[PDB]
Symmetry: D2
Subunit: 78 residues, 4 copies
């Protein structure tokens, strides 16, 4: 690779790596919020599912939940 | 849950969700850098592996690579 | 690696690879059952979740579901 | 769901679950082979990578490896 290409490549890697640091920082801050939640007596596993489903299409989730319950009852789950 | 707990919970979710937005922003910026890389004629799949292995312990990676080559040759790969 | 070790290594790889073939065969049969399910008018995505949760500890799942609902209501989801 | 549908559904779940048992059995046998490998002085992590790459397109893997090395040298890795 020529001098120009080498320069570009170095810049690309440097820039991604700087952004990966920022991403790591934000992940640590998210951890810290859950750590505070745990210390205030909340269930972190459940909190994480709250955040997770609050990103899903709520109609689709409730639709799928209804079909799930229908199937569970049809196979005779008690 | 009482009023206090409700307040805490809302704050927790709000704060995580704000951080998830920031994380999404940073992921988009990482995509954009690779998009620029692609437009300058680089191999994005390979770039991503450069970044990935540049986070690993390089002694361990080279050690494992050596043992790999040893095993491949022992089973007669050509 | 000496002759003995080479023999062992070849046997190891051969045996794992034969088992991976069997695993692939079983995965294909699982796909086929869901294909039959789809052709009989069932919702395969939901079927897959039925199988998935039918492997979980049902007390823990229902416990977590209860706490989830409690949190969702506390943050005022409607 | 009517009687017919209930019957079909039960059959579907039963059949998938029987296949998941077989899959579990095969996974355990794969573990056992690696356990034997470990007891004969082999590096299981490396063995697993041997099996993994022996499923990839070897031209594509070597092509990507070459481009990788080219990029690593261009950014001045030592």
């Amino acid at each position: 690779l020529n001098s120009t290409a080498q320069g570009q490549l170095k810049s690309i890697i440097e820039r991604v790596e700087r952004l990966e640091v920022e991403k790591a920082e934000i992940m640590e801050q998210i951890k810290e919020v859950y750590a505070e939640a745990k210390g205030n007596g909340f269930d972190v596993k459940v909190l994480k599912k709250v955040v997770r489903i609050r990103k899903q299409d709520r109609a689709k989730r409730q639709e799928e939940d209804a079909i799930l319950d229908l199937y569970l009852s049809a196979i005779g789950e008690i």
